[PDB]
């Protein structure tokens, strides 16, 4: 379920995180020009760069812990408030993470592993919900 996908995600974090991000911005190729370093790079070049591995680890950590967090893959409001008030997001709608757990749910329902991918995309609803409320347009 659930709680075992935040393990396998952990598990292998750096691999997961960069191949779920890059199904992100390969399948919203707009979203790539909010990261602009990662302009013009191909999936094994951004793979080779040590400053995608660090972001895309440090974000789906923070990720993973939300999701840990959550009760029934309701987030707490204290962690929605956090990614909103975070001075990076200060620029984003809800639609840019919509997109993410769109990519992210499409990813898990392709792959050889298991994933409980429709609570994925509950928790991403929940998550949007919450982002809503707590002032992202
Ligand atoms: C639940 C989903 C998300 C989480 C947990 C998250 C978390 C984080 C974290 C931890 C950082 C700082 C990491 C670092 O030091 O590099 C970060 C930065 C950032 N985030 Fe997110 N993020 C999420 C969704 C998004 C989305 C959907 C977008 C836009 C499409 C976005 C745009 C950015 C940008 C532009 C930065 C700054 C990167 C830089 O320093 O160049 N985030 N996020
Ligand atoms: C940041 N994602």
Same mark, same amino acid.
């Given at each position: 379920?659930?709680?075992?996908?935040?393990? /396998?995600? *952990?598990?292998?974090? *750096? /691999?997961?995180?960069?191949?779920?991000?890059?199904?992100?911005?390969?399948?919203?190729?707009?979203?790539?020009?909010?990261?602009?370093?990662?302009?013009?790079?191909?999936?094994?070049?951004?793979?080779?760069?040590?400053?995608?591995?660090? @972001?895309?680890?440090? #974000?789906?950590? %923070?990720?993973?812990? +939300?999701?840990?967090?959550? /009760?029934?893959? #309701?987030?707490?409001?204290?962690?929605?408030?956090?990614? +909103?008030?975070?001075?990076? @997001?200060?620029? %984003?709608?809800? !639609?840019?993470?919509?997109?993410?757990? +769109?990519? %992210? #749910?499409?990813? &898990? *329902?392709? $792959?050889?592993?298991?994933?409980?991918?429709? $609570?994925?995309? *509950?928790? !991403?609803?929940?998550?949007?919900?919450?982002?809503? $409320?707590?002032? &992202?347009?």
């Amino acid at each position: 379920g659930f709680k075992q996908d935040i393990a /396998t995600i *952990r598990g292998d974090l *750096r /691999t997961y995180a960069q191949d779920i991000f890059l199904a992100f911005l390969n399948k919203y190729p707009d979203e790539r020009r909010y990261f602009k370093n990662y302009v013009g790079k191909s999936d094994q070049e951004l793979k080779s760069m040590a400053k995608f591995g660090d @972001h895309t680890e440090k #974000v789906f950590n %923070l990720m993973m812990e +939300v999701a840990d967090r959550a /009760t029934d893959s #309701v987030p707490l409001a204290s962690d929605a408030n956090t990614l +909103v008030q975070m001075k990076q @997001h200060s620029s %984003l709608t809800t !639609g840019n993470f919509e997109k993410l757990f +769109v990519a %992210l #749910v499409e990813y &898990m *329902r392709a $792959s050889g592993q298991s994933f409980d991918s429709q $609570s994925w995309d *509950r928790f !991403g609803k929940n998550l949007v919900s919450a982002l809503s $409320s707590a002032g &992202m347009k």
